[PDB]
Amino acid sequence: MKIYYEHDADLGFILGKKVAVLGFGSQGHAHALNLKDSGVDVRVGLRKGSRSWEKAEAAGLRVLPVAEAVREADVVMVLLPDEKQAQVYREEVEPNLKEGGALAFAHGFNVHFGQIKPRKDLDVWMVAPKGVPALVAVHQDASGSAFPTALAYAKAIGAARAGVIATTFKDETETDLFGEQAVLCGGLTRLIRAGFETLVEAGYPPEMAYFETVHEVKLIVDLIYEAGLKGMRYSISNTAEYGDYTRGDLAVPLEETKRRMREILRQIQSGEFAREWMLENQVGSPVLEANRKRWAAHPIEEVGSRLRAMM
């Protein structure tokens, strides 16, 4: 798989261009500040009187309404939540973006699942940071220089150091949603919760349940992060390693789990997940909100709060 570094990227493909960063969350913040520091002509498009409007000015960046920022720009980088992007593109980017302009993202969801259908004259590309490596993709190369522009942008925000990996909007979006659903968030919270409940129902103090099923996860994952599974197994006690090897499959059996995870991936790949999430947003996200309240009330949180407090 193809990796690019600082020397592979040519800042001449960006330094000559005016960049509009829409949004000023953590991503909008980091993108905009690093562009300026790399000496790119950058403005931030925000709604007047917003909290992030004041915050952007405070950081010393030039700030305009979204429509204005876009009229000024050669390159529009959209750093807004997925569910807000479509409306902003339709009503404010698309009428105001120069012929042959570039439209950029950090997440491929909106373009990959057809929520934003870019004008045919635009370049469309993505730089997705994570020694922070980054992913790059080009969905549409109208100018003929989409790719070197994207690479220049990546260097200019500092992602090139640890390496830029070329992918597609498809691969970035699908694997991102899969990871969240199956492993990182969905799967992990369910494992933790089943373990916590198992211990509490068996008569153990909730505090110790929380230690052994929640608090300690960080120790293990930090080892994996630094040195892979192999390194994690090497650092823990032999008792714990033996336990892992011999009981792990009982907790989480391989073929049944992969079967389920294939169905999660199928709902992603088929467009079904995307449809469901977009429809959910059209009627005020009541499933999101109901689930949020219900998980907030889970006894794991009470115990968690009390323990973090006393530590």
Window 161 to 190, contacts with Mg ion (CB under 5 A): 168-170
82 is in an annotated binding site: yes
User: Phi/psi at 38 (nearest 5 deg)?
Assistant: -80, 5
Amino acid, single-letter form, for residue 87: Q
Applying CB under 8 A, among 204, 270, 272, 299 the residue interacting with a copy of itself is 204
The item of Mg ion, a copy of itself, none sharing an interface with residue 55, based on CB under 5 to 8 Å by kind, is none
**Binding status of residue 212 toward a copy of itself by CB under 8 A:** yes
Active-site residue flag, 31: no
The item of a copy of itself, Mg ion, none sharing an interface with residue 169, based on CB under 5 to 8 Å by kind, is Mg ion
Give the nearer residue to Mg ion in terms of CB position, either 76 or 111. 111
Minimum separation from the CB atom of position 103 to Mg ion (A): 14
Gap between the Cα atoms of 299 and 207, Å rounded: 11
Total Cβ atoms within 10 A of residue 67: 13
Query: Which residue intervals of 158-216 are DSSP H helices?
Result: 169-178, 186-201, 206-210
Binding mask 248-277 for a copy of itself (x = CB under 8 A): xxxxxxx--xx-xxxxxx-x-x---x--xx
Gap between the Cα atoms of 196 and 202, Å rounded: 10
Residue of 5, 1, 12 lying closest to 164 (CA atoms): 5
26 is in an annotated binding site: yes
143 is in an annotated binding site: no
Instruction: Enumerate residues 6+ apart whose C-beta is below 8 A from 253.
Output: none
Distances in Å between the alpha carbon of 221 and those of 16, 59, 186, 187, 228? 43, 34, 16, 15, 9
Binding mask 172-191 for a copy of itself (x = CB under 8 A): x-xxxxxxxxxxxxxxxxxx
Query: What are the CB-based long-range contacts (under 8 Å, 24+) for 58-61?
Result: 59/29, 59/32, 59/33, 61/32, 61/33, 61/36
**Binding status of residue 90 toward a copy of itself by CB under 8 A:** no
Taking each helix axis from N to C end, the angle separating 272-282 and 254-269, rounded to the nearest 10 degrees, works out to: 60
The item of Mg ion, a copy of itself, none sharing an interface with residue 208, based on CB under 5 to 8 Å by kind, is a copy of itself
Instruction: Enumerate residues 6+ apart whose C-beta is below 8 A from 217.
Output: 192
Query: Catalytic residue among 7, 29, 31, 107, which?
Result: 107
Gap between the Cα atoms of 21 and 63, Å rounded: 10
Token pair 């997440």 is found at: 107
Give the nearer residue to a copy of itself in terms of CB position, either 65 or 186. 186
Minimum separation from the CB atom of position 84 to a copy of itself (A): 10
DSSP reduced 3-state for 135: strand
84 is in an annotated binding site: yes
Site for a copy of itself in 91-120 (CB under 8 A): 109
140 is in an annotated binding site: no
DSSP reduced 3-state for 164: strand
Site for a copy of itself in 23-82 (CB under 8 A): 81-82
Applying CB under 8 A, among 95, 216, 271, 272 the residue interacting with a copy of itself is 216
195 is in an annotated binding site: no
| Stretch near a copy of itself under the rule CB under 8 A, chosen from 13-21, 50-58, 68-76, 295-303 | 295-303
25 is in an annotated binding site: yes
Residues that bind Mg ion (CB under 5 A): 168-170
- Binding-site residue ranges for NADP(+): 24-27, 47, 50, 52, 82-85
List, as residue ranges, the binding site for Mg(2+): 176, 180, 212, 216
Query: Binding site: residue ranges?
Result: 24-27, 47, 50, 52, 82-85, 176, 180, 212, 216, 237
Which residues does the annotation mark as catalytic? Answer: 107
